Amino acid sequence: APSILSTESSIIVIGAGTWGCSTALHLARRGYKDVTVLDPHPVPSPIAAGNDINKIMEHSELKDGCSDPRSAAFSTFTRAALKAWKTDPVFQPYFHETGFIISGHTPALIDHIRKDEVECSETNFVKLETAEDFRRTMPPGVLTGDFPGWKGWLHKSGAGWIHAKKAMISAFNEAKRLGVRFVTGSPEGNVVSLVYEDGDVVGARTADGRVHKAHRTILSAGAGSDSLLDFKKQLRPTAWTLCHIQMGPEEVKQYRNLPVLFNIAKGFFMEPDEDKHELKICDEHPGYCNFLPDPNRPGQEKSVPFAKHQIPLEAEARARDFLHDTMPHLADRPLSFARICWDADTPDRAFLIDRHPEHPSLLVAVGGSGNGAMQMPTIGGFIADALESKLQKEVKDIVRWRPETAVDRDWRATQNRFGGPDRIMDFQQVGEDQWTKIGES
Ligand SMILES: Cc1cc2nc3c(=O)[nH]c(=O)nc-3n(C[C@H](O)[C@H](O)[C@H](O)COP(=O)(O)OP(=O)(O)OC[C@H]3O[C@@H](n4cnc5c(N)ncnc54)[C@H](O)[C@@H]3O)c2cc1C
């Protein structure tokens, strides 16, 4: 039914974010001559979850008795990703293999980590038992806290952090040098609808009323994808929170080459960025939704993203609680920046990358599920493979279109996340005066 795919086939990519820029770059490398990317914002988009001074990268090989099909698929994604972060000239300068510490501060959290993470991994970890053990993982003056009740595990190699924002820009620049066209801005790149003819997708319509036609359309608009196609509940747009503290010009010099410090029920931080010397803290929790009436499902809810360069005050407080335990000397410092950041969870938090069974010219590439940024170097390769009907067997069935897994989906499932109230939160229940007020009077 669909037109025969060739390198001369016109291709539209909706969304110039983490996955879209990667897909554009891979398509261009494969020789596709007519690729156009649409985005309501210029790269890097302010609403792209990948637009972040840092994200965590981690790869684990699993012991045999822990390798179900879904986790084997994920290891396949991250194995490929890790290799590319270390080699692809477009991405290599932005990966910092500083290691990764996973930890918890109650017996139940520690046991969950030991049983379900550490003992399933082929990684050899260093066990951190005491506050002193924690502090010694970083240079003097960095970690100063008492880590009360904390125990953890340090993974030295195959993990660290990536400069997601610069790597995205790097992928964008290279896609462009290789001939990809980017229509980025509003209304010209703001897609409001897919375009249908004969029951197939033939392109995209933007908010200026222009119709963009293509032989293939790739939907990779992150959380925003959920309003451009009926995903049959397969996506839950969900938001996490970050804030930055601005480090001083002398103090920042100790904060170099730091392993990621992650408490699965409190949060994490990464080292200050090279440009602004800002230290980022994410407070860990199951996520905020923004539950509004589903326009197509009477009596049902649907989480709808919105952009804000503030975070709820309760999130800031969780971030400072994390700081009190680890770096109390910073716990009262003013925030220089904060924002909410949107991704979308599938029901099993595996990716969703597949051609649409009812519209063969449409490829969806969505469902980052909290783990999509570290995939940036290689995800466009899997996505391109899917477009070319050769997505490899280790992953293709795990990431397929699977609406049957989302029937009567419970939006308030915590989906293996912890922290804060240990429940899914709702922005509709956050008071208008209950946000940070960075940059205001
Ligand atoms: C706080 C937070 C921390 C995270 N930490 C990590 C981590 O440490 N490691 C990790 O691997 N992952 C992490 N993630 C997840 C990761 O950021 C996402 O999975 C990944 O960036 C998603 O990539 P994406 O391309 O699907 O979406 P995005 O990067 O959000 O890009 C989507 C793009 O689509 C565009 N768009 C939107 N709407 C429309 C429209 N109508 N038309 C056209 N275009 C459009 C947007 O402007 C945007 O540029 C984190 C996520 C959050 C929220």
Residue numbers in the entry: 2 to 442
Paper text:
In this study, we apply a novel rational design approach to the stabilization of wild-type Amadoriase I from Aspergillus fumigatus. Using a rational in silico computational design and screening method, we have produced two forms of the deglycating enzyme Amadoriase I featuring a significantly higher thermostability compared to the WT enzyme. In particular, the introduction of disulfide bonds provide considerable stability to proteins by locking their fold in a well-defined local or global conformation. We used X-ray crystallography to confirm the introduction of the designed disulfide bonds in the mutant enzymes.
To confirm the formation of the designed disulfide bond in the SS03 and in the SS17 mutants and to assess any possible change that such modifications may have caused to their global molecular architecture relative to the wild-type enzyme, we solved the crystal structures of these two thermostabilized species. The crystal structures of the SS03 and the SS17 mutants were determined at 2.15 and 2.85 Å resolution, respectively. The overall fold of the two mutants is very similar to that of the wild-type enzyme, with an RMSD for main chain atoms of 0.268 and 0.804 Å for SS03 and SS17, respectively. Focusing on the region where the mutations were introduced, the SS03 mutant (S67C/P121C) is highly superimposable to the wild type enzyme (residues 62 to 72 and 116 to 126, RMSD = 0.842) while the SS17 variant (D295C/K303C) shows a structural rearrangement in the region from residue 290 to 308, with an RMSD of 1.657 Å. No significant variation in the geometry of the catalytic pocket can be observed between the two mutants and the wild type enzyme, demonstrating that indeed the introduction of these disulfide bonds, which is intended for thermal stabilization only, does not alter the architecture of the active site of the enzyme. For the SS03 and the SS17 species, the mutations did not significantly affect the apparent steady state parameters relative to the WT. Conversely, the SS03 mutant features a ~3 °C higher thermostability with respect to the WT. On the other hand, the SS07 is more stable in a reducing environment, further confirming the detrimental effect of the introduced disulfide bond in this species. Interestingly, the SSDM, which potentially carries both disulfide bonds of SS03 and SS17 does not display any cooperative effect relatively to the two single mutants; in fact, the measured T50 is consistent with the one obtained for the SS03 mutant, suggesting that only the C67-C121 disulfide bond may be actually formed.
